[PDB]
Write a protein that binds this ligand. Structure first.
Ligand SMILES: [Mg+2]
Ligand SMILES: [Mg+2]
Ligand SMILES: [Mg+2]
Ligand SMILES: [Mg+2]
Ligand SMILES: [Mg+2]
Ligand SMILES: [Mg+2]
Ligand SMILES: [Mg+2]
Ligand SMILES: [Mg+2]
Ligand SMILES: [Mg+2]
Ligand SMILES: [Mg+2]
Ligand SMILES: [Mg+2]
Ligand SMILES: [Mg+2]
Ligand SMILES: [Mg+2]
Ligand SMILES: [Mg+2]
Ligand SMILES: [Mg+2]
Ligand SMILES: [Mg+2]
Ligand SMILES: [Mg+2]
Ligand SMILES: [Mg+2]
Ligand SMILES: [Mg+2]
Ligand SMILES: [Mg+2]
Ligand SMILES: [Mg+2]
Ligand SMILES: [Mg+2]
Ligand SMILES: [Mg+2]
Ligand SMILES: [Mg+2]
Ligand SMILES: [Mg+2]
Ligand SMILES: [Mg+2]
Ligand SMILES: [Mg+2]
Ligand SMILES: [Mg+2]
Ligand SMILES: [Mg+2]
Ligand SMILES: [Mg+2]
Ligand SMILES: [Mg+2]
Ligand SMILES: [Mg+2]
Ligand SMILES: [Mg+2]
Ligand SMILES: [Mg+2]
Ligand SMILES: [Mg+2]
Ligand SMILES: [Mg+2]
Ligand SMILES: [Mg+2]
Ligand SMILES: [Mg+2]
Ligand SMILES: [Mg+2]
Ligand SMILES: [Mg+2]
Ligand SMILES: [Mg+2]
Ligand SMILES: [Mg+2]
Ligand SMILES: [Mg+2]
Ligand SMILES: [Mg+2]
Ligand SMILES: [Mg+2]
Ligand SMILES: [Mg+2]
Ligand SMILES: [Mg+2]
Ligand SMILES: [Mg+2]
Ligand SMILES: [Mg+2]
Ligand SMILES: [Mg+2]
Ligand SMILES: [Mg+2]
Ligand SMILES: [Mg+2]
Ligand SMILES: [Mg+2]
Ligand SMILES: [Mg+2]
Ligand SMILES: [Mg+2]
Ligand SMILES: [Mg+2]
Ligand SMILES: [Mg+2]
Ligand SMILES: [Mg+2]
Ligand SMILES: [Mg+2]
Length: 349
RNA sequence: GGCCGCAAGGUUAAAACUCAAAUGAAUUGACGGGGGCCCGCACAAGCGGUGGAGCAUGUGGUUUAAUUCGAUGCAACGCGAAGAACCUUACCUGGUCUUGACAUCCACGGAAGUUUUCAGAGAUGAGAAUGUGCCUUCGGGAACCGUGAGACAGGUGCUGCAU
RNA sequence: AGGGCUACACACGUGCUACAAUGGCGCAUACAAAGAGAAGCGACCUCGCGAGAGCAAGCGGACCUCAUAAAGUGCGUCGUAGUCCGGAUUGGAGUCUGCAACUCGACUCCAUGAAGUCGGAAUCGCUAGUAAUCGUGGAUCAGAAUGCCACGGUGAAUACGU
RNA sequence: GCCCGGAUAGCUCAGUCGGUAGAGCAGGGGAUUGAAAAUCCCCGUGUCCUUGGUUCGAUUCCGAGUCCGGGCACCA
RNA sequence: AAAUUCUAAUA
RNA sequence: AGCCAGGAUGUUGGCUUAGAAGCAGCCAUCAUUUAAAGAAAGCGUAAUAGCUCACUGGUCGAGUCGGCCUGCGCGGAAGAU
RNA sequence: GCUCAACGGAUAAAAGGUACUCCGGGGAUAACAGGCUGAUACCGCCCAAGAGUUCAUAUCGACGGCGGUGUUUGGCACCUCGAUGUCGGCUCAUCACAUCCUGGGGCUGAAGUAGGUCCCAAGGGUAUGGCUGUUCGCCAUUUAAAGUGGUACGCGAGCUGG
């Protein structure tokens, strides 16, 4: 019980705050809200109270800054550190009131041709170095070589802890402006690469052939069989009530063989049905976050002539391009989160 | 669509849409697996090497806190470097300073120097003796030291595709 | 202040030393040019197996010092062996410069004695005192060249031709 | 359901007659090229489908299984 | 006797 | 078994969380006063609250409450002239 | 001197079609229907992990267990081979109840209107068309509802003949 006392101290306000709100009889007219308060617990009250506490403390911290001729170093440092600490604490306690599994990383060439492939190789090397200096694992699922340099198209899987929550922001277009290595003259060229980041989902399968949701019809066959065929129920038809799929078999002389093989055909025919839907959902997701590598839609730019890297989503410009290219891209992704979760403080209604 | 033909097809003959040009002759080069005439250790004739081995040295890649920066077809790679244990040093870890290590300006107190001790990895900090004189209308100015404030100094930071 | 630029599964360029008898070793003994030197070059003598130590003349130099050239010639031995070829790596004991040789200097002595038996596809330099081979000096610099820049000794083969 | 055949390198395929596994393409390095192919030189392959047994010893011989290809499933 | 190719920003 | 009375004390518990306060699920179950009362067996609540039950007193006042071995019966037990 | 291995060995020497078929026999032996059985099928019940905010039993019921019926597919080969005409439709029916509608009740997570599930009840009632030879099924539009089964899977000395 290292920090259970903080939980009890939080308990000791809603322990009687909740009473006048459970029976206030303003949030009960609609059916959903009563059980929302019952199950979703006590988010609104304690979160608003903790927001007010944060606002008061931040108001306290701002003051006491216009003073000179005194050793204002360590007390100012500790005051701003407490400001940032409470800021992060309230940030998390209000964002929470997840998705931190493994990831798939795909990069492929956009405008440029061979130069795009070379930049794809460079970009993949950057991501691999970043993963390597995190005790993560990279495994090459698929590769398509680019005759001159790197990869037309590379798919890898990155394994670790909390991988997705860091790399989900790299999906989009990346623009590179530089003098290509495949170019006789000395011309600057602008080209692009396209990146997609996917979460790793569970892939369970269920044989939904539970007899409680089947209907079997037994009847006569048709064709030439003599007198035994007329007076016998050798033809089977199975229909699946949920999915509405019907399979009929009368190929053999025996009802049992017909029922068995028609049941197998029904199983295969139903399994393909959800395989196709899963494939199409995944393809639509990829097409939506992937983009058309076209140097006009892009998330960031790398300018090698001026040694500059810029992120257009947050309008940030650093002049540390070679550190970026050496797998130290955390400085490009830490501020992004701060902007992203800067929306989460507003998203409360 | 019409006419002609056994057929293959012939003859008559548009529109939407799209581009800002398409084209002719001649001029100067460059190029040709076009033609002539020449040259160069360029081939041919020779002699000795390199590619294999061990070591010296530079580069790429990989590693690292850093492995400083630049040259990188011929025309970069015993190159800048005619010489990295400290220094050089521009890189890394850690410890320190803020008109300041290097200059001019203003004011204040001080010959400059020379010996020490203590603490510290050192930078640095604290104390004590030591001498306080030199051209100077005895107005002192002046060599050089500490402190105080800002005009500033400082940059081996970026662009050789601004020079 | 300390560390790093000297890292090391790997690949490339430029060099040095060899794989031996036109040689290795031992003894004896002839023939150069060019250059540097005052916080410098340092003789003679004594000590040390040696790297060096001590004392100490001469020299701002056609005068003193570095500083005995080597390949070469005479005699002996080895007799085709991974060897009396080769000298990498490692262990022990030291010298010098420098405040300071652990990372990371050079040299000396004792011990050790690796790959290597003339090098695939490919590729380079040289037309005469030149290629090939043997020594000597200088700048940088307290110390630290197999690199760079210079100097001499011995001394070829070949060019029908385009 | 019955009968026959097959499972060998990253991919398509040879081969054992009980002690020992190959070929083409692909792969790694180096050459040539201003550079990429074509070309040239050097180099590495696998628990011979799974499982039980006989045997000194099983890819091989003998039972069962899984998957794959083929032929049959007729008289009413 | 052989013998392929050189994207996209200086004009 | 009836018929009357009591049927208590700090545990809004810390234990899981706003809630588990006797009563959804997670450890524990001491102690006090008493003739007696369980850190709660049940109902009932969102926590509540309350209503019971165990235990102990009072009238009545004669038997009473469960298992084991066996004999015979009951349900489970719906079809086509 | 025989894998005369069909191993008491038919000849030294030998494969198929018949829906164009024919004869002698068999219910000693199959296909339709009856019979016995009940693996399969359909219908009930037992225990209660769980799901249902709480809560096993309003409504469902995991892993397992116990029965009924004689509608399906079968197993057997007891009747019929000196003949028991076989699918669907038409006409005409009759019975069981495991009840589709109407009637009467209990419990509901039953406010009312509408539902869920179970108990009693067999009096009467319980569609027309498109497609297909269809039984089965899908579709259109109705109805209080368009029940489930037995009767040689009723019914050709009553019709038809897809
Ligand atoms: Mg037939
Ligand atoms: Mg025409
Ligand atoms: Mg014709
Ligand atoms: Mg023209
Ligand atoms: Mg023209
Ligand atoms: Mg020409
Ligand atoms: Mg020409
Ligand atoms: Mg030649
Ligand atoms: Mg070599
Ligand atoms: Mg470098
Ligand atoms: Mg440059
Ligand atoms: Mg050179
Ligand atoms: Mg240094
Ligand atoms: Mg230029
Ligand atoms: Mg440039
Ligand atoms: Mg210039
Ligand atoms: Mg230093
Ligand atoms: Mg270096
Ligand atoms: Mg001189
Ligand atoms: Mg030899
Ligand atoms: Mg030897
Ligand atoms: Mg020797
Ligand atoms: Mg020795
Ligand atoms: Mg010449
Ligand atoms: Mg010479
Ligand atoms: Mg290769
Ligand atoms: Mg050709
Ligand atoms: Mg092409
Ligand atoms: Mg072009
Ligand atoms: Mg009974
Ligand atoms: Mg009984
Ligand atoms: Mg009857
Ligand atoms: Mg016989
Ligand atoms: Mg016999
Ligand atoms: Mg016999
Ligand atoms: Mg029968
Ligand atoms: Mg539950
Ligand atoms: Mg029957
Ligand atoms: Mg019979
Ligand atoms: Mg029989
Ligand atoms: Mg019989
Ligand atoms: Mg019998
Ligand atoms: Mg009969
Ligand atoms: Mg008869
Ligand atoms: Mg008969
Ligand atoms: Mg008769
Ligand atoms: Mg009857
Ligand atoms: Mg009934
Ligand atoms: Mg009824
Ligand atoms: Mg009812
Ligand atoms: Mg009836
Ligand atoms: Mg009736
Ligand atoms: Mg009746
Ligand atoms: Mg009646
Ligand atoms: Mg009546
Ligand atoms: Mg019927
Ligand atoms: Mg009938
Ligand atoms: Mg009759
Ligand atoms: Mg007919």
């Amino acid at each position: 019980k290292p920090s259970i006392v903080a939980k009890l101290e939080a308990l000791h306000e809603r322990h009687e705050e909740v009473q006048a709100l459970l029976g206030d009889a303003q949030t009960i007219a609609d059916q959903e809200r009563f059980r929302a308060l019952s199950r979703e617990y006590a988010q609104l009250s304690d979160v608003s109270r903790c927001f007010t506490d944060w606002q008061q403390v931040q108001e306290d911290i701002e003051t006491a800054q216009m003073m000179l001729d005194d050793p204002e170093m360590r007390e100012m440092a500790q005051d701003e550190l407490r400001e940032a600490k409470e800021k992060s604490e309230q940030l998390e306690q209000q964002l929470q009131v997840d998705d931190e599994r493994n990831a798939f990383l795909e990069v492929r060439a956009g405008t440029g041709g061979d130069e795009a492939a070379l930049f794809a190789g460079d970009l993949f090397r950057m991501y691999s170095r970043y993963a390597e200096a995190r005790r993560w694992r990279v495994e090459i699922m698929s590769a398509s070589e680019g005759e001159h340099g790197g990869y037309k198209e590379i798919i890898a899987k990155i394994s670790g802890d909390g991988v997705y929550g860091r790399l989900k922001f790299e999906s989009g277009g990346h623009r590179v402006q530089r003098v290509p290595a495949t170019e006789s003259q000395g011309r600057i060229h602008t080209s692009a690469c396209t990146v997609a980041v996917m979460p790793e989902l569970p892939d369970a399968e269920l044989p939904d052939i539970n007899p409680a949701d089947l209907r079997i019809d037994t009847f006569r066959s048709s064709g030439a069989g003599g007198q035994h065929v007329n007076t016998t129920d050798s033809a089977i038809r199975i229909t699946h009530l949920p999915t509405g799929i019907v399979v009929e078999c009368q190929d053999e002389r025996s009802q049992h063989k017909n029922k068995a093989k028609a049941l197998s055909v029904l199983g295969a025919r139903i399994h393909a049905a959800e395989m196709a839907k899963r494939q199409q959902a995944e393809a639509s997701t990829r097409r939506n976050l992937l983009g058309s590598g076209d140097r006009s839609d892009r998330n960031r730019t790398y300018n090698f002539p001026q040694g500059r890297v810029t992120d257009h989503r947050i309008n940030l410009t650093l002049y540390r391009l070679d550190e970026v290219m050496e797998g130290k891209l955390d400085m490009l992704i830490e501020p992004i989160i701060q902007e992203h979760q800067a929306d989460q403080l507003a998203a409360l209604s």
